[PDB]
Symmetry: D2
Subunit: 248 residues, 4 copies
C-alpha cells in the first residue's frame, strides 16, 4: 500500500501545499482543519479526483483544553481508520497573534501554547502509541531568537515546539521514528496584511528580496520524510532565504 | 526605601539561597510558597531577626488554571503591599518529573508548562503592569535544554518556552527600563558529579544565587536577554 | 549544459560519496585530492567510464600559506577549464588530529585552520569572483558545541567554517549564490579503528545505534544543491542520528 | 600578595576599562599594546601612582606568523617576571575591518584570524603551561550570528574564539582554570563616526537606545573572574542591551 500522512491545518496556505506535495509524492493524506471546512473538502475533492480514496478530512479544534488529548487521539485514529496506517505526521496548525505584556489571557494561552506546542506533543504521543519510514515534521519559526515585538506567547509556543522536536527525536529514535522541523522565515504574507507592509518584509530577505512560496516550504518537509533523510533526526532546517542572518 | 524582590518557590533549596542572598544584599523579600508554609515562615523568621519587617511570605499554587492569572497578580501585589515597590522578580518555582511519550496528562501540562512557563509569563505581565531605579526579572532556566533528559518532554518544552519568554520579554520591556535575564543551572548521584568538568561536583545553591545577584546588580545594567549558564562545564561534555 | 561541481578532498570516504552522487545526479565533477592520487584517478576513471569527459582530478595542498590563495584560485579555474562553468562548490577536505593545550604548533594551525576554514573562504571568494542554481556546501560538524577533548584547533576551524557559512550566505545571496552546511555526527568510522571502540560510538547514536554511511551524508548535500532547496541559504543540516542531543 | 592579570589590547577603549577595573579590584596588571605606546605607558603610570609596582606594559604584534607563539609566550612570561604569578588572562585585542568576498588577502587572514583567534589560543596554551582562582575571559561578539556584511574573516575569527572558549573550558577545567567569554553588542562608538551613523546604531539598542560604556563591558569581565563565578566555565555573557534580539 501507499504510505499515509496526517497534516494539521492543511486546508489553506502552507499546510495545503504540504498535503498536496505529499499527495503528489504518492502519500494518502488526512487533511485536518479547524474552521476552513469548505477549503478542506474541496482540497480533498481535487486529490481524490487525481487518485480515488487517497484524501480524507478531519475536523478538530486544537486549543488546549481537557479534551485536547482525545481530539489529538482522534486525528491519528482517523488516519488508521481511513488508511490502515500512519507513516508521517506534519504538525503545521498554528495560531498567531499579539499578546502584549503591557480574548481573555487564559484563552490566548490555550490557543497559542495549545496549538503551537501541546497539540504537537499529544499528536506525537498518539502517533507513537499507535505504531518502515516513520517520521514527524514540526513547522517551527526561523525567527524564534529575534522575535516579533509583543508576540511573547506565540514565541514561547514555537520555542516549546523546538524543545519537543529535540525531546521526541531522542525518545522515539529507538522505535525508528524520526522527528525534525522546518523553520520558515517569511512565506505567504497574509493578503490580510497590506501591500506596503508586505514589501517592507520582502526587502529584508537577502536571497531574492521575496518571501518563500508555500511550495518551497513543502519541499523541505518532503525531503525530511524522504528516504534521503533516513539518518536525520532532531534537526531543524531553516527555509528563510537568509532572513535570520540579517542584523537590525 | 530598600529595594524589594519577589522570589517564587523560595522556601527551600535554590529559591531559599536566592532569597537569603538578595536579603544579605539589602533587598526586602517576598518568600512565595505552595506547600512549604513551615519552611517559608521559618526563613522569613530568620531574615526578620536580621532586619525587622524585611521578609514576608506569600502562598500561591502556580499550577496553570483559570485562577493562575489571579494568583500571579496577587504575588506581585503582596510585594507592593508589604514594601511599596517591587524591583526584582525571580521566577524560580518549577515542577520536575518525567512524562514518557510511549496525574492525567492535562495535569502534567498544567504543572510542567503552567509552573515552568505560564506562571513566569503572568508574573512578568503583572510585574510590568504594576510599575535611579533598577528593575529586573531573572528566570531560572536549564543549562541542559539542548541535550534533554530522556522522557522529560514536557519539562523540556516548559524550559524552552521560558527561554523564549526571557528573550521576548527582554525586548518588549526594555523601553520600560526592565531587564530580563536567565540563569541556567546544570546539576546544582555520583554518576552526575563525575561528569562535571569543573571539579567533579554539583553547584551549591549559593553558586546559583551568586549569578542571580550579579544579574540584578548595577554591574549588569546593560545586560538583558542573556542567559548565564552555571553548570561547571557540564553542557559542553559529549555523550 | 550539464552543471559542474568541485568537491575538495573527494578521493575517499565522504568526499568520494559526494562526488559519486553529484555525478549520478548529472554533474560533471572536479575531484580535488592532496595525497590520495591513486584513489582520485581511479574514481575519475570509473565516473568517465559511466559518462565520457565528466570527471577530472586536481591536486593541491590546502594548508594555509602565502600560496594558498593561488592554489584555491587554480582549483576553481580547473573547473572552468574542464567544463566551462562551475555551479557547485563542496568544501569537504579537512584535517583532524588532537592539539592538547597542556609538528610545530604553527604547522598545526596552518593545517587545521587552513583546510578547515581558510581554504573554504578562499575557494568561496574564487568561486564567486569567477561567476543558474549556484551553491556552496561546507562540511561542518554536529558535535561543535560538545567538542572532543584536546581538539581545540579542529574545533576552532569548524566554528570558523560555521561563521563563513553564515557570512558568505548573507554576502552572496544578492548574486543568487546559496551557501549552506551539512554537519555529520559519526559517519564511516575509520576501517583501522578497533571494532570495540567503534562500538562505543555506535552505542551512543539514538537513531539505530549505527554511524551514518557516507551516502547518507551525500544525500543531504544533494538536497542542498537541488532545485528543492532554492530558498535555503545560511542553513546547516545536521545528519547525526540524534547524537548531538545526547547528554554526557 | 595581589593576584595578577594580563589584558591584551589594554591601552585604549574596552581593554583599558578592563585593566583599570581589574586594578581597582586588587589585581596587578600587564597592559599589552601593539601600536599604542603613549597610551599604554600613561595608563601604567596612573595605576602605579595609585599602588606602586602594580602595572607594566608589554608590546607585541598579535598577527599570525611563525613567531606568534614566541610573542604569546613572552606576554605571559612578562606577567610572571613582573609579579611572580599570573591568575587572569583577558583576550581583548582584536582587528576589525571589511574583507569583501567579491593588504594582501594573506595579511588580512593573519591579522583577523591571528588576533581574534590564534593569539588567544596560543596565550591560553602559555597561560596554562605556566601554571587559586585562575581564569580566562575572551571578548567575543554578541552579533556573531547576524554578521555585518563583508566582514567574513572577522566573523570567522570570532566564531573560532567561541570554539576556543568551549574547548579550553573543557580541557582546562581539571586544572582549575575557568574559561568564559563576554560578548559586547555596540559599546563606546568611535569619534571617527558620523552623528547620523552613531544614531543609526543607537536607535536599534532596545535597552535605552544607547551603546554600552566600556565600564559596562568591564563589569562583566570582573564578575567572571570573581569568586562569585567559581562554578561558571564555558559560558559567554552577552552585554548588548538586547541588540542581538532585534530582527531585520
Ligand atoms: N507563514 C509564514 O511566513 C510562517 C513564518 C514562520 C512560521 N510559520 C509556521 O508555518 C506554519 C504554517 O504557516 P501558515 O502561515 O500557513 O499558518 P496559518 O495560515 O496562520 O495557519 C495554519 C492553520 O492552523 C490552523 N489553526 C489555527 N488555530 C487553530 C486551532 N485553535 N485549532 C486547530 N487549528 C488551528 C488554521 O486552520 P483552519 O483555517 O481550519 O481554522 C490554519 O489554517 C505554522 O506552524 C507557522 O507558525 C509560517
Ligand atoms: N537543582 C538543579 O540542579 C537544577 C537543574 C536545572 C535547572 N534547575 C532550575 O532551577 C530552579 C530551582 O531548582 P530546585 O532544584 O531548587 O527546584 P525544586 O527544589 O524542585 O522546586 C522549587 C520550588 O518550586 C515550587 N513549586 C513546584 N511546583 C509548584 C506549583 N505547582 N506551585 C507553586 N510552586 C511550585 C516548590 O515550592 P513549595 O515547596 O512551596 O511547594 C519548590 O520548592 C528551577 O526553576 C529548576 O528547573 C535546577
Ligand atoms: N567522518 C565523520 O564522522 C565526520 C564527523 C564530523 C565532521 N566531518 C566532516 O566531514 C568532511 C568529510 O569527512 P571524512 O571523514 O571523509 O574526512 P577525512 O577522511 O578525514 O578527509 C577528507 C579529505 O581531506 C583532505 N585533506 C586533509 N588534509 C588536507 C590538506 N592539507 N590539503 C588538502 N586536502 C586535505 C584529504 O585528501 P587526500 O586523501 O587526497 O590527502 C582527505 O582525504 C570533513 O570536513 C569532516 O571534518 C566528518
Ligand atoms: N566596541 C564594540 O562595540 C564591540 C562589539 C563587538 C565586540 N567587541 C570586542 O571587544 C574587544 C575590545 O573592543 P574595542 O572596540 O575596544 O576594540 P578596539 O578599539 O578595536 O581594539 C582593541 C585593541 O586590539 C589591538 N590590536 C588590533 N590589532 C592588533 C595586532 N595586530 N596586534 C596586537 N594588538 C592588536 C589594538 O591595540 P593598539 O591600539 O596598541 O595597536 C586595539 O587597541 C574586541 O575583542 C572586540 O572585537 C567590541
Ligand atoms: N501561525 C502562523 N500564522 C501566520 C499568519 C499570520 C497572520 C495571517 N493573517 C496569516 C498567517 N504567521 C505569519 C506571521 C507573520 C508573517 Cl509576515 C507571515 Cl508571512 C506569517 C505565523 N508566523 N504563524
Ligand atoms: N576531517 C575529518 N576527518 C575525520 C577523520 C578522522 C580520522 C580518520 N581516520 O583515522 O581514518 C578518518 C576521518 N573526522 C572524524 C573524526 C572522528 C570520527 Cl569518529 C570520524 Cl568517523 C571522523 C573528522 N571529524 N574530520
Ligand atoms: N576589534 C573590534 N574593534 C571595534 C572597532 C572598530 C573600529 C573602530 N574605529 C573602533 C573599534 N569593533 C566595533 C565595530 C563596530 C562598532 Cl559600531 C563598534 Cl563600537 C566596534 C569590533 N566589533 N571589534
Amino acid at each position: 500500500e501507499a504510505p499515509a500522512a496526517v497534516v494539521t491545518g492543511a486546508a489553506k496556505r502552507i499546510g495545503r501545499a504540504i498535503a498536496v506535495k505529499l499527495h503528489q509524492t504518492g502519500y494518502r493524506v488526512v487533511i485536518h482543519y479547524h474552521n476552513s471546512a469548505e477549503a478542506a473538502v474541496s482540497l480533498a475533492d481535487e486529490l481524490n479526483k487525481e487518485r480515488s480514496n487517497t484524501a480524507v478530512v478531519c475536523q478538530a479544534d486544537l486549543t488546549n483544553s481537557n479534551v485536547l488529548p482525545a481530539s489529538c487521539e482522534e486525528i491519528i485514529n482517523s488516519c488508521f481508520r481511513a488508511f490502515g496506517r500512519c507513516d508521517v505526521l506534519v504538525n503545521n496548525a498554528s495560531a498567531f497573534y499579539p499578546t502584549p505584556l503591557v480574548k481573555t489571557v487564559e484563552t490566548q494561552v490555550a490557543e497559542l501554547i495549545g496549538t503551537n506546542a501541546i497539540a504537537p506533543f499529544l499528536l506525537t504521543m498518539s502517533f507513537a502509541q499507535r505504531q518502515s519510514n516513520l517520521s514527524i515534521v514540526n513547522l517551527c519559526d526561523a525567527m524564534v531568537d529575534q522575535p516579533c515585538m509583543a508576540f511573547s506567547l506565540y514565541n514561547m509556543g514555537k520555542h516549546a515546539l523546538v524543545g519537543l522536536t529535540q525531546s521526541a527525536a531522542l525518545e522515539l529514535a529507538p522505535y525508528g521514528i524520526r522527528v525534525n522541523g522546518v523553520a520558515p522565515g517569511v512565506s505567504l504574507l497574509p493578503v490580510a496584511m497590506g501591500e506596503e507592509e508586505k514589501d517592507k518584509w520582502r526587502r529584508k530577505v537577502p536571497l531574492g528580496r521575496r518571501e518563500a512560496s508555500a511550495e518551497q516550504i513543502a519541499d523541505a518537509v518532503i525531503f525530511l520524510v524522504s528516504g534521503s533523510a533516513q539518518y536525520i533526526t532532531g534537526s531543524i532546517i531553516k527555509v528563510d532565504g537568509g532572513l535570520s542572518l540579517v542584523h537590525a
